[PDB]
Amino acid sequence: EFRPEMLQGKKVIVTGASKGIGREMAYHLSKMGAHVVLTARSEEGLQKVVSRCLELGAASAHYIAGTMEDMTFAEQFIVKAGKLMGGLDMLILNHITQTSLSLFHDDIHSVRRVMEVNFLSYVVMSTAALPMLKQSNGSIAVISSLAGKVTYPMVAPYSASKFALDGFFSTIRTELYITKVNVSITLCVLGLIDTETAMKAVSGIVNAQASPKEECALEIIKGTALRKSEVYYDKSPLTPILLGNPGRKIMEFFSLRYYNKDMF
Amino acid sequence: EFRPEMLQGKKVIVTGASKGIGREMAYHLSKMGAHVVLTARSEEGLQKVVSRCLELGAASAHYIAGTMEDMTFAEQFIVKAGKLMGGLDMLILNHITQTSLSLFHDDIHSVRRVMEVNFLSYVVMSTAALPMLKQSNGSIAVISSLAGKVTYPMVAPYSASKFALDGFFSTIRTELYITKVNVSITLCVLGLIDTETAMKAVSGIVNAQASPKEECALEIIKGTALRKSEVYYDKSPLTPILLGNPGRKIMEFFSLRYYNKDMF
Numbered sequence A, B: 001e002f003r004p005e006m007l008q009g010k011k012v013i014v015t016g017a018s019k020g021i022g023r024e025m026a027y028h029l030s031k032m033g034a035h036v037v038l039t040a041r042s043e044e045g046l047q048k049v050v051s052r053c054l055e056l057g058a059a060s061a062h063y064i065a066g067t068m069e070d071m072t073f074a075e076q077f078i079v080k081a082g083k084l085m086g087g088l089d090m091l092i093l094n095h096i097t098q099t100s101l102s103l104f105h106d107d108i109h110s111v112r113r114v115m116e117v118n119f120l121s122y123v124v125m126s127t128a129a130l131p132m133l134k135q136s137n138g139s140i141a142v143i144s145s146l147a148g149k150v151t152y153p154m155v156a157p158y159s160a161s162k163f164a165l166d167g168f169f170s171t172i173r174t175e176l177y178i179t180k181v182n183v184s185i186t187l188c189v190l191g192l193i194d195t196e197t198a199m200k201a202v203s204g205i206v207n208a209q210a211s212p213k214e215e216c217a218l219e220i221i222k223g224t225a226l227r228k229s230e231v232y233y234d235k236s237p238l239t240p241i242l243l244g245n246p247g248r249k250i251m252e253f254f255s256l257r258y259y260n261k262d263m264f
């Protein structure tokens, strides 16, 4: 079971922390006495949150600002964040590029930039951060969506980038497990959350019930601290079960016999 | 019930058709007596296969050479192809980048390479081809892997692009359907296929039984022609069931009742 002391004095990165879900995780982490380094495009939005974080009890709080469409920034940012803290216990990949609802029509340029920001910068940052994480037996939080397990109309690009997250990190997850690297990867599948940017976007298009961003943030943290493979945070009770996919678990367990053990 | 007569004289595009599964689908379509345009990087390799296709009885056979790493080629190929045949009934997106089995150690450049060719190019051509496919109510086939539904080690970049296909094209399908477009989208979930490449590539790493390439090809063509959401071909029979994932289906279904039709 979870104890906030588990994050006390621990080094934690959070991308997308200037608002929404990722700001809330900044506060919760700050109240648990972790060291945090935060980042986003908005330099002023990052300032206010670090300032709140310090009032909230954070051992230390630093921002670095930029855009995660730039892979150079994505990687160098991890390196500065590990130098400011002297290590890295937890990498939480949360930011996403400006998304809207709409039927797909001819966006090669939209699809790419989405893929880079919502997928590429995650892979960039995971691998840059993995040496420091391997040293601490740390954990990654990869924040995804029901739309990373099932599909909804009007969100083809975004949805491509979340599916890609499962495919990729799930594979990293097993590989780590089989080569005995004690780093955990939590895929955090979430339903509608009442962040300001989600509601504005669904307005007049989707009429679902949203869940609170504060508690959402909480389950993400606790799930990753507890080295869980997946977190499901959604309003409906019949979500983790209809999304269970017991076949995928069965296939993944047996597929290993296909492999030469020496490879591992 | 599938009738090969169905494809006599139809206009088909096949990618990665200079060898492997791609080459088989061209042969088959040719015996059915269809028009084909083939593409891939190999100039002379493409030539042997067109010469062969014409020998088998293809209505027509042409090729356009190039790399699908370049989106400009990807769009413009579909345009030249369309002209060459005067239209399009079936687009087969099949090509993939050089792919090796190994624990993940790629740098971002390589991973972008994987996602551009394996994924981004697929989105590009289906977008470009869509107008003719509407013109003819044709079909799209997206060649995926079991690795696009569940995870296997040593294949995370590949598995990502594959997962990114299910997410994107499943969305497009739903969107085409709620808007009454008569273009169908067939995701083909393949198991190990005894193509030269994969066999020598799994050599010493994976000991599974392969499915025959000639049949695989036909099962692709049959499904896309019958307009199936998904095709499953793999030596094990208990596979399509386990990968059934009825919950996702049940869930994608009720999901529309939370939308406003004014967007239809």
Ligand SMILES: NC(=O)C1=CN([C@@H]2O[C@H](COP(=O)(O)OP(=O)(O)OC[C@H]3O[C@@H](n4cnc5c(N)ncnc54)[C@H](OP(=O)(O)O)[C@@H]3O)[C@@H](O)[C@H]2O)C=CC1
Residues within 6 Å of the ligand: A015, A016, A017, A018, A019, A020, A021, A022, A039, A040, A041, A042, A045, A066, A067, A068, A069, A093, A094, A095, A096, A097, A098, A117, A143, A144, A145, A146, A190, A191, A192, A193, A194, A195, A196, A197, A198
């Ligand atoms: N709320 C919901 O309904 C659901 C949310 N999720 C996932 O939860 C996570 C966070 O959601 P949420 O808090 O609502 O999102 P928000 O839109 O509220 O904010 C996310 C963060 O991303 C940052 N950001 C935006 N663009 C860039 C960029 N180009 N480079 C770097 N940072 C950027 C934002 O800061 P800034 O603009 O200043 O750069 C912001 O701090 C995302 O991964 C989302 O996909 C998943 C399912 C449902």
Ligand SMILES: NC(=O)C1=CN([C@@H]2O[C@H](COP(=O)(O)OP(=O)(O)OC[C@H]3O[C@@H](n4cnc5c(N)ncnc54)[C@H](OP(=O)(O)O)[C@@H]3O)[C@@H](O)[C@H]2O)C=CC1
Residues within 6 Å of the ligand: B015, B016, B017, B018, B019, B020, B021, B022, B039, B040, B041, B042, B045, B066, B067, B068, B069, B094, B095, B096, B097, B098, B117, B143, B144, B145, B146, B190, B191, B192, B193, B194, B195, B196, B197, B198
């Ligand atoms: N074989 C198997 O066991 C399985 C295969 N699949 C899927 O089946 C499909 C076909 O695979 P397979 O026939 O076995 O592999 P092959 O290597 O035999 O064929 C791949 C084709 O893609 C072409 N190609 C490679 N790179 C590019 C590029 N950058 N631009 C354009 N064309 C390119 C190749 O030609 P050239 O190099 O000259 O460009 C070749 O014709 C793939 O999508 C794969 O994921 C899925 C599950 C299992």
Ligand SMILES: Cc1[nH]c2ncccc2c1[C@@H]1CCN(C(=O)C2(c3ccccn3)CC2)C1
Residues within 6 Å of the ligand: A098, A099, A100, A101, A145, A146, A147, A152, A155, A190, A191, A192, A193, A195, A197, A198, A201, A202, A206, A208
């Ligand atoms: C577009 C967009 N921009 C955003 N900026 C910030 C946060 C969320 C979003 C979003 C969508 C809105 C909700 N999102 C979902 O993934 C869920 C969903 C999708 C489609 C239909 C029903 N639900 C809730 C699962 C993410």
Ligand SMILES: Cc1[nH]c2ncccc2c1[C@@H]1CCN(C(=O)C2(c3ccccn3)CC2)C1
Residues within 6 Å of the ligand: A258, B098, B099, B100, B101, B145, B146, B147, B152, B155, B190, B191, B192, B193, B195, B197, B198, B201, B202, B206, B208
């Ligand atoms: C490496 C490599 N190069 C290739 N060049 C051309 C075609 C396929 C491949 C491939 C692998 C071989 C098998 N592939 C799979 O996607 C499946 C799988 C993966 C892992 C373990 C058991 N099965 C069959 C599903 C793709």
